[PDB]
Amino acid sequence: LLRHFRDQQKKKVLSIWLSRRHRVMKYLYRVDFNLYKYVCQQLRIKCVRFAIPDSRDRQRAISPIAVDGDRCKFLIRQK
RNA sequence: AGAGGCUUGAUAGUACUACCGUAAGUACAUAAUAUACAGUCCCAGCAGUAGCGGUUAAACUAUAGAAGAGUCGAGUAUUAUCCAUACAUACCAGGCGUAAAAAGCGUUCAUCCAU
Numbered sequence: 494l495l496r497h498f499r500d501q502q503k504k505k506v507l508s509i510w511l512s513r514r515h516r517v518m519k520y521l522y523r524v525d526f527n528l529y530k531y532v533c534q535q536l537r538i539k540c541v542r543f544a545i546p547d548s549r550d551r552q553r554a555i556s557p558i559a560v561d562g563d564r565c566k567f568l569i570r571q572k
Numbered sequence: 573a574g575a576g577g578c579u580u581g582a583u584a585g586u587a588c589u590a591c592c593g594u595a596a597g598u599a600c601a602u603a604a605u606a607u608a609c610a611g612u613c614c615c616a617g618c619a620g621u622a623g624c625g626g627u628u629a630a631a632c633u634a635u636a637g638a639a640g641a642g643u644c645g646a647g648u649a650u651u652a653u654c655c656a657u658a659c660a661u662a663c664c665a666g667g668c669g670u671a672a673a674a675a676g677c678g679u680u681c682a683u684c685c686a687u
Contacts, residue, residue: 508679515680549682557680 515557519543537563 494503522529522543533540539562547554559569 505678510679512679546683547681551681554681 511557511560515555515560537561539563 494500494507518529518541530540532538539560541555541560556570559565562569
């Protein structure tokens, strides 16, 4: 997407993968907790636990875009 | 008529707790009618969504118009009020083709649903 900016059709495809990966973490967290922490350290992915339902407020809800905060420093938050 | 207020053009099934065809104010006296008739004639009026009134229609006024043809009755009737009678106030018990009603196409939060 950086080199090609007129390809608006693939913009919708990226969202599908981002949401799909989020659901994977939820399932793996309940079946194996020790393994969930080990995989995050190797890939340097922000580990997040799923123990309570997420609130409806956007100022404190989860954000699948900023999952890889360590690897990406320009897609964390804004005003 | 021991006694008054309504209707007198069509339309309305006119209430239901016992009895549920298992019986007479049954017959004589004791049988009749009002879509007969009178006044005005798009003028005066009545009425209920629909309407009538010009040449005379049971639709307007009038019952010494005949001991009024009817329903109530010591009351009757108009307006007003509510969850306004299945105009279903819609779980029981209405919809989303043409008729009033499905967001331009899609991934996500919460809730609900699933084997």
